[PDB]
Amino acid sequence: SKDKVTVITSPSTEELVSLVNSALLEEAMLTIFARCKVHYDGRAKSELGSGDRVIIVKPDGSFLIHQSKKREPVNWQPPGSRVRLELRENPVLVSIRRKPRETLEVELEEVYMVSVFRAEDYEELALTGSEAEMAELIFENPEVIEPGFKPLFREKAIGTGIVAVLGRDSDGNIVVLELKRRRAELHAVRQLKSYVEILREEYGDKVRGILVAPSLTSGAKRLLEKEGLEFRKLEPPKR
Amino acid sequence: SKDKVTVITSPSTEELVSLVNSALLEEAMLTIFARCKVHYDGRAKSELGSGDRVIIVKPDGSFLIHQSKKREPVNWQPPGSRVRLELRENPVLVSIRRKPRETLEVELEEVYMVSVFRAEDYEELALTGSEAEMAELIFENPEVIEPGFKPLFREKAIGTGIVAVLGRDSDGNIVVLELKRRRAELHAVRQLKSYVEILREEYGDKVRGILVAPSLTSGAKRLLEKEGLEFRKLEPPKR
DNA sequence: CGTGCCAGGTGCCGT
DNA sequence: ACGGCACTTGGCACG
Ligand SMILES: [Mg+2]
Ligand SMILES: [Mg+2]
């Protein structure tokens, strides 16, 4: 079928081969319901025993294997990986990524369903409420930080690390912002501390770090105060 | 129902409702190829225009929407979400996470396929090469760091943060390790630096930080040296 | 390309 | 639950 969808339940091997072939050839979406084994070797090494999973191969090369639980595929393979279907005692999907070299091997013990989905999507996701949006707010409304704040750079490389927003205040200090779109953790305060220390090595003792977020974890608040750093409450804007 | 798979191409709304509702009640995997619009509101806010996607709803509430590219769902919902099918101008899949309130709405414009996959999986993933396994190696073979190293605590909480490994050396110094199973970057060093500074205040300047990892980024090397910390090369072990 | 970092990050484990 | 952090993190923007 050259309808959007082809489905075959309990395929024969040649049926199985046929659909996998066409999926790849047509830049379609291959979906398989099968009982399988999965072997991964790559950055790490992985084994998964016999069980039912859903398998998806995207035309861009992405490979997903999902069990009945979580949000995360049990094994996978990133965009740009090449897949082929080898016939050994059972059919085996083999997907290889290079740089770094990673091979994914799915032995298909029984294929309950194979399907080809020739999917048209021209639309891109529009997302609001991000950190960049916070940045834009600050550049178009600096008073949202403090009065007379003068934002200068965004995503600026200082020597070691990249600062979210860099600027000055009314009294002439350098001011660093670390923004976070959620509750700020130790991770963030360490970013901020790191930057501020580097800027001090040049502009000496007049520099302020300011952590801009909707809130802080206990430890963030703790460490923040300890190192004499500041916090301003800010929500990411939605539009 | 006994069949692993139930699938219907071009299903009527009646047929859709049957299988969708069966999927939830039977606690099975729902799979749908469809033309759809997507609306997300939650931590952020999101709009996806009309186009074709694969949709998976797992019995544990996890909800996936995959376009024909990348590895990441364009929208999703975490485990423990609750989904209902709603009949409005078109069928709408509605997944609601509470705690934090997050709403996903999938308007099904045309459903090309709906399927129920009753998947039996008793197997769990066995992965090796983790950072945890790095730590285990070090406690079994402390010499992989340096002669005379005596590892003592693992994931030990110092006042602010949690140190991966705390130990002592031949000079009887307190020693911090941060482990990375892959090439270490600036925040690895920031972590280490953070911990060490905290301990220096208790135990003095004797205290050594060591970054333990298969390799370093240029930037990490730079900050490491600048702060007088150390680097030991270690590859994560694979069973 | 490698470096650095956000992400609706997710998952895990501790208190 | 909140916290602190690893993850085969993935994906992006920038030098
Ligand atoms: Mg930053
Ligand atoms: Mg660690």
Side-chain angles (χ1 to χ4, degrees), chain A residues 131 155 162-164 177-180 191 195:
Chain A
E131 194 229 46
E155 290 283 344
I162 306 181
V163 167
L177 317 185
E178 198 53 30
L179 326 175
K180 291 296 165 264
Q191 275 185 51
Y195 303 147

Side-chain angles (χ1 to χ4, degrees), chain A residues 43 53 69 193 197, chain B residues 41 58 121 181 193 197:
Chain A
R43 296 172 286 183
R53 291 110 201 183
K69 278 153 26 74
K193 182 180 178 290
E197 272 171 15
Chain B
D41 204 341
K58 296 185 181 179
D121 213 333
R181 71 154 308 285
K193 169 159 186 294
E197 292 198 343

